[PDB]
């Protein structure tokens with residue numbers, strides 16, 4: 001059950017942009033989107049892959065808890081917030097790729113593939129380097145498939161411990177106030193065309209949950225704030241947030 | 243309190259500017275250092291009122307009275323003054339709207355013996371639950387000070403309480419109050435009205451990237467028109483110490 005609400009295209013038009021927003025009303029089990037075809041087009045997950053990567057790392061004990069310190073590897077990189085020690089909370093918040101590349105090496109090719117199949121995550125293909133396949137390898141996932149994966153995480157239904165799922169959902173916390181809670185992860189995929197930006201997660205209300213997954217063309221980094229802004233425009237229009 | 247508490251008396255200016263009287267207690271986790279405007283009141287024990295929802299939720303989860311934070315507790319049909327209470331709730335919304343009737347049923351199901359044993363295990367306040375099993379934190383014998391709230395919250399933060407790690411994680415999720423790009427606040431307000439002196443509480447912590455600041459405040463609350471000062475005075479103090487922008 002998926003309704004094409006093409007009136008949302010205006011929110012992309014207004015901003016000089018092309019993309020898709022997908023919403024899922026958990027209570028009514030109804031889905032909405034501006035573009036059914038792009039909603040099912042698969043892209044590299046890029047930094048949104050930190051969600052399954054964190055889950056696998058916790059379930060295998062590569063990460064013991066959300067306070068364990070991961071030492072900076074001593075390589076100065078362009079994003080300054082990466083050149084410091086991190087735990088799981090701050091590595092997610094600052095999208096610290098080197099920490100997650102190390103997770104993937106310690107998970108290893110065999111267990112990564114097995115768990116992604118267990119997760120039904122995208123096309124379950126990890127072809128490429130073990131520490132970069134979600135950046136420039138074979139894995140692809142659509143907006144609707146992100147939703148399906150996130151729904152399982154929300155319900156503690158993934159095939160990892162309940163504890164690992166609770167810790168990752170804590171690490172995904174982005175915004176909270178008296179009206180809603182957002183747990184989400186951004187992404188920006190540049191190594192292979194098309195360059196796109198991601199925002200995936202959900203909005204917790206008192207009596208319902210709205211899952212969302214959006215991607216949009218992102219020729220330059222100047223447009224990155226449109227990921228959250230366009231999603232919220234749709235969320236507001238649909239009365240989900242004030 | 244291994245390190246001696248530090249008294250910052252300039253914080254009283256934030257009480258007197260509102261013609262109010264109270265205490266703010268802060269604990270810098272990295273430095274293991276406590277601060278307060280009034281050491282005597284910091285150690286004065288009061289009824290916890292709604293802040294007791296934190297230990298109550300922990301015990302109910304550990305004993306299986308609450309299966310998880312999605313289990314629905316049906317409205318019992320009685321219409322009460324606070325409109326948000328007249329509806330079904332789960333643990334998240336019962337904490338958010340401080341739905342007393344839900345927590346009175348938690349306490350009844352826990353029962354006197356297990357409730358006493360658990361609060362002695364937590365070393366919660368004066369550990370005294372004399373009174374009605376479903377009202378002793380409103381009008382019975384239990385008392386806790388602001389510094390004792392800090393000690394209890396610090397154990398909860400570190401998962402050191404004598405309940406399952408899972409119960410502690412769930413309650414910390416339910417305490418979520420505020421989150422933005424700078425900080426996260428997990429906290430619980432309280433308003434004690436059945437027994438004098440009427441007082442307001444705000445207890446919790448601020449999570450930063452690299453540190454956690456625990457806080458506990460209470461203040462005299464002769465009328466409900468001062469209730470916003472629980473959060474506002476605490477945030478003034480947090481800002482003066484450059485903890486939040």
Ligand SMILES: *C(=O)[C@@H]([C@@H]1NC(C(=O)O)=C(S[C@H]2CN[C@@H](C(=O)N(C)C)C2)[C@@H]1C)[C@@H](C)O
Nearest residue numbers: 046047048093094095097186187188189224
């Ligand atoms: C993840 O796709 C990439 C990583 N994450 C990311 C983003 O999701 O936008 C960036 S942008 C950079 C500027 N602020 C930081 C951030 O976490 N946000 C914008 C939310 C990081 C960066 C390219 C990774 C594959 O490089």
Ligand SMILES: *C(=O)[C@@H]([C@@H]1NC(C(=O)O)=C(S[C@H]2CN[C@@H](C(=O)N(C)C)C2)[C@@H]1C)[C@@H](C)O
Nearest residue numbers: 291292293339340342380431432433434469
């Ligand atoms: C718990 O102390 C009482 C409950 N909690 C509470 C409060 O701490 O504020 C109130 S005040 C009432 C008006 N606004 C709502 C609120 O909870 N907040 C502003 C946070 C509810 C209420 C008296 C319980 C013992 O009655």
Ligand SMILES: [Ca+2]
Nearest residue numbers: 117119120121
């Ligand atoms: Ca599959």
Ligand SMILES: [Ca+2]
Nearest residue numbers: 256259475478
């Ligand atoms: Ca003030």
Ligand SMILES: [Ca+2]
Nearest residue numbers: 249280281282
């Ligand atoms: Ca003094």
Ligand SMILES: [Cl-]
Nearest residue numbers: 046047097100
């Ligand atoms: Cl990544």
Ligand SMILES: [Cl-]
Nearest residue numbers: 151152155157
């Ligand atoms: Cl399912």
Ligand SMILES: [Cl-]
Nearest residue numbers: 161162163408
């Ligand atoms: Cl568990």
Ligand SMILES: [Cl-]
Nearest residue numbers: 170173415418
């Ligand atoms: Cl949380």
Ligand SMILES: [Cl-]
Nearest residue numbers: 291292342345
């Ligand atoms: Cl209560």
